[PDB]
Amino acid sequence: SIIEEQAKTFLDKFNQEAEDLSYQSALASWNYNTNITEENAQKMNEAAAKWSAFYEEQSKLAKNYSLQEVQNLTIKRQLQALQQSGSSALSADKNKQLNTILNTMSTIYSTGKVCNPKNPQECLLLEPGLDDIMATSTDYNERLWAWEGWRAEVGKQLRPLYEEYVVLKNEMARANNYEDYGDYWRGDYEAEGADGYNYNGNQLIEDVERTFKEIKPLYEQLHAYVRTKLMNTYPSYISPTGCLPAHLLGDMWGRFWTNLYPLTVPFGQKPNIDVTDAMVNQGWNAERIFKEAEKFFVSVGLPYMTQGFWENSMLTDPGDDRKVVCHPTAWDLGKGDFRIKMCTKVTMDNFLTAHHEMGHIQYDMAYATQPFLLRNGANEGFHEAVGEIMSLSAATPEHLKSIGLLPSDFQEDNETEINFLLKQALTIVGTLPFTYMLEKWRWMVFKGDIPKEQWMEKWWEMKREIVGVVEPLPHDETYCDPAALFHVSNDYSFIRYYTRTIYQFQFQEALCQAAKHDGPLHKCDISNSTEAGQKLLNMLRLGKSEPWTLALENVVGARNMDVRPLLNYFEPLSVWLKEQNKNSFVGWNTDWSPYA
Amino acid sequence: TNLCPFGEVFNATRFASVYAWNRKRISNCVADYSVLYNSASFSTFKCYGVSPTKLNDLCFTNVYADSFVIRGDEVRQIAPGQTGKIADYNYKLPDDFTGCVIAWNSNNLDSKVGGNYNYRYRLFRKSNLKPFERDISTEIYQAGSKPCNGVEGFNCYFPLQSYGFQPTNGVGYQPYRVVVLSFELLHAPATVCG
Ligand SMILES: *[C@@H]1O[C@H](CO)[C@@H](O[C@@H]2O[C@H](CO)[C@@H](O)[C@H](O)[C@H]2NC(C)=O)[C@H](O)[C@H]1NC(C)=O
Ligand SMILES: *[C@@H]1O[C@H](CO)[C@@H](O[C@@H]2O[C@H](CO)[C@@H](O)[C@H](O)[C@H]2NC(C)=O)[C@H](O)[C@H]1NC(C)=O
Ligand SMILES: *[C@@H]1O[C@H](CO)[C@@H](O)[C@H](O)[C@H]1NC(C)=O
Ligand SMILES: *[C@@H]1O[C@H](CO)[C@@H](O)[C@H](O)[C@H]1NC(C)=O
């Protein structure tokens, strides 16, 4: 118990310095992200360099403590968080090589351009370009060439870079008691504590498989219905028993199916609920939306908003000689400072992204009492999971007519629910197989089970075996299809969007059960419910102080992930889809390709 | 007749640090406290032992005034039977206290853009404070078995840390000014009343 005292008296000084340094860095960043100029960028760089150097030096200094003689778990987690900094634990030349490889990969991805094969002088980019042509166009050959050109001009350049990047990342990973750049990523899903509460990185690879195996049939039903509906547009290319081509899924990669709604409306003879004219004619400004969100949040027992929030937050575009970065975000400046940056228009999607950001801000406000190296989420998916349930809650017609946006005599019909459920499904359940595939492929490439020869042949068979998507043209071992994605070529993990989707419906079901709500789960509103807010606040009061198993149990009472709430949310849609698919084939075969 | 110099304590331009808080004696000085009570300027006026309403009849020999500046979330530590960083190494009150404290915000007169690092507070010390004691020492704190040699390094720290007051921080981080009044009934004749 002699190292205990030394660690305790060192963490205090570390916290005292880190608070000020982080506040300076965050303030510089916020100042740049509103009044963009060259001096502001210089100030950002000079503020961030000092914080990075201080953090690295403090980690190196603390690397003379040992986790085995520390029995208090409160400071053991802090020491583990501070010591785990194995990004510079490599030779300088190798580090410079790695950085230049990331830089050149990013430049190739951003600068990449493809040209019209019939009009040479028109060449397009991704953001003002190919993305729009996939979102809107319908012609088969147009989508085909736009897909193939991007695949052939990104992969050809990013193949050897990725090939020689894998070995460098494995070398970096096998210096922190890790076997590859796999387990290193999975190490966030780590917990320690009482009996039955531990969670290592090898259980995630089984929990994910179990959850996907339970999920699959609903995706099969949705895929069969989409395949049956997608024959009045291309009645010469779709096989009733086969799969779906990759260049017809409303997106460049197939990440989201939300762009297939106009071609797959269940009942197209009635518009969906879009309350925008109601706010336009009632005289609503940017501040009223945030006041309504504040009222909704205080209704459930959560605290008010800080006075400085209403003065230091840019809730609308200045509309002058001040160009800004217009992207919604929530900031935690530190030292009790909370701000929200977002361009606000009088429209419904802004009305929802305001609730999302205020949920983030409340979650940040909750754990301000914890030590410095404990103020974060719990499983890298809790933030957006907490922030996205408010969007679901504040979109029910009952909530809309309870605030003065719908007539009091509005009677909700039944045909609209099928449309809304299908629209939600095309975004929620139509992306899980893609995420599971991408993450498993990356893991098994990093481990070494895929050699260089099977690098691009396993991918284009796992896709048809899991997702149900086949390529329109054959691809040899000179392409790099996964590299043509932002999250793959920019070192971003790809399990958050699966884990968040799993937790969201568990949280929603627990909160709705606490509120004593009868009826379907998709018409639930947690307003005027103090017990639900109390349970949520009891959850979001710890941060990283306790293992995330306790955080999950504080709300749902479960020790691990569960998918039954997700299926319960989509019961009427499943019944309707089963009723519609009486004279159609449900599954698919993997021995069909539109080039043989 | 004489008034009493409470305007040189509450209305002073410069206050002292927590580890070097000033102390002032009240002489044979006719004082009034209801004027202090009926002023909507203090965020904390709670009195232990005596009641503020019937505080113009009691007579005392000497009255002590102590002043310093602390953070917003540290006023609760200026109270008998309290434990924390402030009331263990900087300023500690006894359990038989018979006076009371005054606190109010000082953000506008104490915060500057970029940081005001003129206020410092003790962070490391061996023993407790032995209430109503001050210590002004810059000796290097020794944590490990290896002795320090007047230089900062491993397990050797400087036991002084400065505040980071800024005009944008939250209420729990805005600076607060604290004035503590203590009354003693000595064996000398009660010299002044209200
Ligand atoms: C939550 O409760 C509040 C009051 O506790 C409701 O506000 C009132 O709602 C009634 C409708 O029954 C109106 O006639 C009042 O004018 C409202 N008063 C105020 C001050 O808003 C609120 O409607 C409830 N919300 C939900 C979703 O049930
Ligand atoms: C410190 O000095 C100020 C004057 O600058 C005093 O302000 C008093 O303010 C109230 C209302 O704000 C007035 O009604 C008084 O007349 C003011 N006093 C004087 C003497 O002008 C303030 O009271 C002083 N502080 C103390 C503790 O006496
Ligand atoms: C933006 O920065 C410039 C200098 O970089 C400064 O002159 C100007 O006042 C700033 N504008 C605002 C609104 O802060
Ligand atoms: C531990 O301390 C020694 C000197 O006491 C220092 O040389 C060494 O670098 C420290 N450990 C690490 C990992 O830096």
Tab-separated table of C-alpha atoms in Angstrom, chain A residues 6 9-10 13 16-17 20 23-24 27 61 64-65 312 335-337 339, chain B residues 85 114 117 121 123-124 143-144 154-155 157 161 164 166 168-170 173:
chain	number	residue	atom	x	y	z
A	6	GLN	CA	2.203	7.812	-4.488
A	9	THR	CA	-0.719	12.067	-4.874
A	10	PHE	CA	0.412	12.044	-8.509
A	13	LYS	CA	-1.348	17.082	-9.871
A	16	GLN	CA	-4.906	19.968	-11.969
A	17	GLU	CA	-2.635	20.508	-14.972
A	20	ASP	CA	-6.359	23.851	-17.649
A	23	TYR	CA	-9.710	23.876	-21.486
A	24	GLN	CA	-7.210	26.016	-23.402
A	27	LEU	CA	-11.415	27.028	-26.302
A	61	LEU	CA	6.425	9.464	-16.374
A	64	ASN	CA	6.832	3.577	-13.614
A	65	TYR	CA	3.732	2.401	-11.779
A	312	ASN	CA	-22.043	31.350	-25.780
A	335	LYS	CA	-14.717	23.720	-16.384
A	336	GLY	CA	-18.513	23.690	-16.500
A	337	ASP	CA	-18.797	24.968	-20.082
A	339	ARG	CA	-22.269	24.874	-25.926
B	85	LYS	CA	-8.811	20.070	0.299
B	114	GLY	CA	-6.754	34.434	-20.890
B	117	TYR	CA	-3.218	33.181	-12.134
B	121	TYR	CA	-3.788	27.458	-2.823
B	123	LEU	CA	-2.345	21.110	-2.297
B	124	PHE	CA	0.057	18.901	-0.301
B	143	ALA	CA	6.325	11.533	-1.107
B	144	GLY	CA	8.688	8.579	-1.563
B	154	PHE	CA	10.025	12.086	-9.207
B	155	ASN	CA	7.934	11.984	-6.007
B	157	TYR	CA	6.317	18.308	-5.823
B	161	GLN	CA	-1.113	25.537	-7.236
B	164	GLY	CA	-7.464	29.375	-13.542
B	166	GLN	CA	-11.757	32.902	-16.648
B	168	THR	CA	-16.578	32.065	-19.377
B	169	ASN	CA	-16.404	29.240	-16.807
B	170	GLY	CA	-19.408	27.887	-14.939
B	173	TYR	CA	-15.732	27.710	-11.131
